[PDB]
Amino acid sequence: EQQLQKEEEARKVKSGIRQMRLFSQDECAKIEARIDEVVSRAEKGLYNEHTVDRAPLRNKYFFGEGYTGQERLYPPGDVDEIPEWVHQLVIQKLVEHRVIPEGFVNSAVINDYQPGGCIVSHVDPIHIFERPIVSVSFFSDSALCFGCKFQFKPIRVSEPVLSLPVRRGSVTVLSGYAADEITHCIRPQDIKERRAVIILRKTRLDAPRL
Numbered sequence: 309e310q311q312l313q314k315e316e317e318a319r320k321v322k323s324g325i326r327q328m329r330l331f332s333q334d335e336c337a338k339i340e341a342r343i344d345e346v347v348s349r350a351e352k353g354l355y356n357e358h359t360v361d362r363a364p365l366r367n368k369y370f371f372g373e374g375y376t377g378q379e380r381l382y383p384p385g386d387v388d389e390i391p392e393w394v395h396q397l398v399i400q401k402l403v404e405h406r407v408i409p410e411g412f413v414n415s416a417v418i419n420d421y422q423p424g425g426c427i428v429s430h431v432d433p434i435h436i437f438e439r440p441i442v443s444v445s446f447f448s449d450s451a452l453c454f455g456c457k458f459q460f461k462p463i464r465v466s467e468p469v470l471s472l473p474v475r476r477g478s479v480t481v482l483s484g485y486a487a488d489e490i491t492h493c494i495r496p497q498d499i500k501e502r503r504a505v506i507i508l509r510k511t512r513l514d515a516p517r518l
């Protein structure tokens with residue numbers, strides 16, 4: 309049956325996921341206030357054009373490096389640099405906890421979700437980003453789904469291969485099978501209240517530029 313295939317796939321996805329709670333209630337509160345500062349600055353028109361991407365239920369803020377399966381890296385300096393508080397409050401903690409080495413992160417993206425927000429099935433562009441992919445969830449708890457046939461064929465398949473809880477203050481690290489061989493997504497029903505995520509990545513040298 310398809311039950312053995314779904315279990316073997318989930319096994320493979322799991323081996324590409326590492327997760328741990330690194331940030332306390334207070335550390336989150338400090339970072340969450342800084343994320344609110346970023347939303348204000350965007351609204352004040354203080355950022356470069358390509359720094360901010362506005363969409364109905366979700367907003368994206370690109371720092372260090374940003375982009376538009378033919379994604380392209382904007383020319384150097386076209387997006388705002390990674391704010392100091394990100395280096396100080398987020399990247400440092402990860403470096404101290406041996407999640408990623410120092411100097412690795414050149415790209416930080418903040419996704420800001422409304423309740424009812426979602427991300428459609430995708431693979432983090434392999435031509436743009438190196439692995440691993442690190443992400444830290446903030447305002448509330450949610451879930452990350454892997455294997456996303458269901459978003460398009462809910463008749464033939466009603467569930468993802470795997471759902472991963474992403475609680476406030478947790479660090480999720482994706483590599484191998486989980487980052488390369490399978491799509492991920494977030495379902496609208498899994499975002500009940502406001503949610504933000506900071507995604508920390510290194511871009512590839514040969515990432516096709518504009």
Ligand SMILES: O=C(O)c1ccnc(C(=O)O)c1
Nearest residue numbers: 419427432443452474492505
């Ligand atoms: O919101 C998230 O946690 C999340 C998870 C996986 N991918 C993305 C993305 O923006 O690519 C965001």
Ligand SMILES: [Mn+2]
Nearest residue numbers: 430431432492
């Ligand atoms: Mn992603």
